[model samples]
Target: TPAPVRYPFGEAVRLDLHPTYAELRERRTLLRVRVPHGDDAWLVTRHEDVRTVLTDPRFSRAAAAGRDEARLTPLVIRTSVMGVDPPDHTRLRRLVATAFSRRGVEHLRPGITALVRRLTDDMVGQGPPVDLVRSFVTPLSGLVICDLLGVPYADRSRFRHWLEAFFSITALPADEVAVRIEAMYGYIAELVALRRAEPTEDLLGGLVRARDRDGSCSEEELVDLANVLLLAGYHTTASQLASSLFVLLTQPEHAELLRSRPELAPRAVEELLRYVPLIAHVTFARYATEDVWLGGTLVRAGEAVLPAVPSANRDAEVFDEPDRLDLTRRHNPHLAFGHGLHHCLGASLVRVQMEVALTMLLGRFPDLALAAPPDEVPWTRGMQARSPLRLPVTW
Candidate 1:
């Protein structure tokens, strides 16, 4: 048996998957590894095994909680939507589903498109050599999510600080993290109270109604759901936008292809989602509910497992020419949003946002290219994920 290696073997330079993942997919069924915190875990890399761990009832997120489980962050979050298992997860998800469904994110398309155009207009005015991450990605993602949830966009910087602590691998002091988290919770609670007093058409308003009028969820659950949605929706989308733009800028012909054939936008977005490997490593851990066979290896009850979805996304058995970026590639069943009961609730909204943003930006900026060399592009600090901290670009 091989000794446990430190997990997430390398950095995501140029948004590339760590080479170790590909090696593991070939040589190992599962590898035991140590994370920044907690007990050693089985790192499941093969697509088939990754899916089984994610979807199978026996691999439980709920069971991993408060158990010194394997995880990326020093501080474990157990009470949010990501921490729970089904039934309870189903209930919390149901309330959120209602709000997203009632608004039908497709209806947000026109607004999103307009917002993208407006942001591009600003980018044009600022001229070339602009940081796309700051000039465009941050605003588009932050504003759209804010509009949907009725949160004040001006307050984004405040929460952006608070949210980073949750995902940071270089864990801040526990007491400091706790204080920031409580501040975020209090801010969201105030918004919920405001919605309760004066109902509005946004998703948060809908959630407020669900708690107060329909007896659907408690006030605490309502706050948790909203807080998670706000944090999850904003940063991930921003990172994706930055990463996707970096990918396209590096491969200008791909951006040119999109400019010529705008209809390929959806497919391109899917490919980017698969190719980007958004999170640096797996964030959530699933524990074995019983002795379970995963990729022919036994995983006992209470043991933790980290499914490397990015590795699974690039499995040779799953994708043709797995390392190559093919925008028009069909048959993409990527687990970018994840698999099973915990698949991202904002999947549709994110897809549309990516499609619209990429299409509009590429179409409007025909000559867009990176202002800095690909190797010189500065990446965001943190182990959770990597994106261009400031994507300098010129037209």
Candidate 2:
């Protein structure tokens, strides 16, 4: 058989599906693609295979130990919770997970709802043709993360700049990525010191105290963890908010359905998570600890696997009419937030935020519609997460 053809994800999704990712699933299941201006990596497409690699311990999460051999991005590999394995992963996750537990996030619900409402009201008052992404999505997520981490709200835009640079696949030079990482690390270090001197109820304070209590995390580990949460917790949710909005606004019928059946908001959020799944690719850069057969391909020990979460969420084998956005989808086992040991610690929080945002938007603006054509809306390119840069809206 001829070698399976591979298309760049951005090009394929942009030109063919016009932002919907059905084309990605319609193509090959396992694709050989260059890793965003970096080294070559296998992009796993199917849902079962993606989950298999995600949950299986044979595929190590932390490829940093073999970084020299792998030649991975230093900034990404070094200060990432995704760069550790086993006991360390368990311990590190436990430390942060405590701060993001269901009950913990529940305690934060009223505040998050208030933030969502505040932003929604602002957008509504701003009149039609508002850029929902800039006016609401980004700010809401930035505020939520800032509040959670005890970072001053005033400093958010500054940190946002650093985050943009840190995650940029094209703008910054490889060496400057390290500088941006260091700047973020330095800011977190200062916060840690403040928490040490005057502990508070914020997540950062809790983490600082946890470190002092158990000494499980080193200074390096703590800095890395803080950076991880700051970036992951904020940016991923921001993208999800943008993408989900784009999905809903494009489909006015779904918007009407959501408005009529307010109860479907929660289910709609999950379906959106599956249908409008963010994070085009999974991080953690899984390495084969032992020879593994995945999707009928032989991945030798030490080979890296990049599971495409977005593609997996739409796999036909798992979801019925996988491409369709079923607001009432129940029993959604999609791994949009991932699964198993490495599942997203803030998954519940993200869901709640998204639900509140969508519900409030539909309830407030029952006739919300796109101000521009779907094809004209610009999307962020070359980032791990996929989201429209601007989602212009009108009621």
Candidate 3:
């Protein structure tokens, strides 16, 4: 077979199910591919093998950070759980997981519902021809996660700088990325200190309790973990929600169907989660420990590995008619939130927010339509997460 093409063949803001993607599915599980950075590594894009790479102890998450490996997120944001192995990874992740657990987020459900309504109500009151991303979705996601984690919603613009920089490999200078990351740590450190004094029943407070009450983690560990939560919560949810909205609006019938029959929201959401490729590749790429066999590919020790989520999720063998969007589709096992131990902790939080937001959005604007031609919509490029720059919509 031919050598694997470097990732990101195009910038179109839709499922990247190119003919090449299909060809790769028939070819191999992990192919030796060159990255834009000019280094060669095994590119993982098959569903079953992707899961294997993610879960198998033969790969190391922490070792990659110590080496000058290519980063999906910023290099400075490495103190989070993804950069560590078990025992430390297990202990830290467990303490933080309690806050994002289904039961834990239920406490904030009332606040979330109210927040979604308030944001949508503002959008409707302001009238149409507004960017759905700016006017509602972005802030709704930003605020939802911020409030849950006790981060200040008013200062979200500062966080957006971090978001854009964290993913851009070439646009910004390395020094600037380092500086911005430090600023983020400073901001998170302040929040950690504030929570220590006046603790609330949020994720921040959850971390504080893990530190003070249980003595499970350290102060340094506390700050880094919160930084992880702060950085993780913002853009991923924002883009995922916006991308979902973009799809529904473009295919108005799907929006209408959901609007007409709100009862199928559960199944609809399952398919949407599977269908959307908000994050094209898994954040923080994996690294191999020793020479190991991965889906018939021998990955050498200490080499970087990239998991193509969009490709794997669309693998025809796994998901029937993978290109088609079926809201009623059943038995979906999409890795939108990924798999194994590092599966998204905020799965419940994201589900609740989107369900509430979309239900209200459709109900509020029955005749919602795109304000401009779909192809002309501006999109974010050179970033780990992808979203429409502006979703021009009218009711």
Leading candidate by lDDT: 1
Error of model 1, residue 147, in angstroms: 0.7
Error of 2 at 2 (Å): 10
Candidates, ranked, TM-score: 1, 3, 2
Tens-place lDDT digits, model 3, residues 1-395:
34766655555346455566567677876666655552456777788767777768888887776676654433445557777889889988888677788898787778887987888778777887888888888778788878877888898767678756666655577788888877887888888888778888877888888899899888878888877776667887888888888789887889989999887777787788888877755545678889888656778888878777777788788899988888887698887887887788888888888778888888888898999877777777666676788998888
Off by over 4 Å in 2: 1-40, 68-75
| Comparing 2 and 3 on lDDT, the stronger one | 3
lDDT of 2 by residue, 15-124 (tens): 12333235545654455555544345566777878887888989886653664323223355454566777888888887777667778788878998898788887876
Clashing pairs in 1: none
**Candidate 2 TM-score over all chains jointly:** 0.90
> Considering summed lDDT, which 10 consecutive residues are worst modelled in model 3?
70-79
In terms of TM-score, how similar is model 1 to the real structure? 0.95
Number of residue pairs clashing in candidate 2, backbone atoms closer than 3 angstroms, sequence gap of 3 or more or interchain: 0
lDDT of 3: 0.76
- Whole-model Cα lDDT per candidate? 0.83, 0.75, 0.76
lDDT of 3 at 346: 88
lDDT of 1: 0.83
